[PDB]
From Swiss-Prot:
Disulfide bonds: 255-290
Lineage, opening ranks: Eukaryota, Fungi, Dikarya, Ascomycota, Pezizomycotina
Organism: Cryphonectria parasitica (Chestnut blight fungus)
Reaction(s) the record says it catalyses: Hydrolysis of proteins with specificity similar to that of pepsin A, prefers hydrophobic residues at P1 and P1', but does not cleave 14-Ala-|-Leu-15 in the B chain of insulin or Z-Glu-Tyr. Clots milk
RNA-binding keyword on record: no
Interval of the full protein contained in this chain: 90 to 419 of 419
Protein name as catalogued: Endothiapepsin
Amino acid sequence: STGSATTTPIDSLDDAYITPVQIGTPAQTLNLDFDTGSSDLWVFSSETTASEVDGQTIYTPSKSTTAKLLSGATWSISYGDGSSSSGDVYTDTVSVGGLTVTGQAVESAKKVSSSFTEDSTIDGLLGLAFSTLNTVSPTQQKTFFDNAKASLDSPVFTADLGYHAPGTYNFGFIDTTAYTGSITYTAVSTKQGFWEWTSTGYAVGSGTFKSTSIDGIADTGTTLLYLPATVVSAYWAQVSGAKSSSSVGGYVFPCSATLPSFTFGVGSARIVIPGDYIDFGPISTGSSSCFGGIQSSAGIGINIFGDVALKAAFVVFNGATTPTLGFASK
């Protein structure tokens, strides 16, 4: 089997991407944030505290003939940005882009933090990290990808995120028309539950490539590119007037600036992030100070190749017995 679904930016900055997901019988379609940095499939629901729902589409298990309470199971998750959610669990039929999993754990939110309530466009998350990070207790549950794996033509999914445009998540096949050149594969560590890999270095604009190992995670659920302070300083030093602002919470730059590209290494291959991808616009409406798309990972504890980086590539998440990551230009 295979699946193929379009993923669409939620706003004009590509702050996140939503992908339609069919849950239950008859189908209830919710727009979920596919997140390769977590491992819970959770939704706004009929059980979500009413004051914490503001425009989202909810899953109502009582209207699904295939929904079954997973008795005794609860979940609770906190994300790197400080947001959180918790609730109980149903199993139900879940389909993405024509690919169907029966008996998928669908985590029903009873509580969500402000950030989720305030984002009307995201109806929940679909985690695509390794199932060892799943928060369901007392019986940990499998991700949609893990459940689908044995039925897939190939045990892979791919992320092809657009810049200010829709893109595609495919399951079970590699679309050889979706990228240019060849795919370079690189080793993955699952020790922390993430798609964790080691970049071979970086360049700023047309500068020389610096060979250096950068351990980080491929995370579709994070907007920006978070790298070591040394690297990020070297980037923003090439932008006149750029500075790190403690009041704003990162690097800002004059909106009148032209940004240089940023290159990262995948083995001997190179992925180029155009400068425009690194512009996240005025810090506040009407401001001439713009927020940078490359930020320091210092104090996160991990480097994060988020959407800013991933949308510059066609990315293969290979969930074979020995997992790997592939990157191609496009």
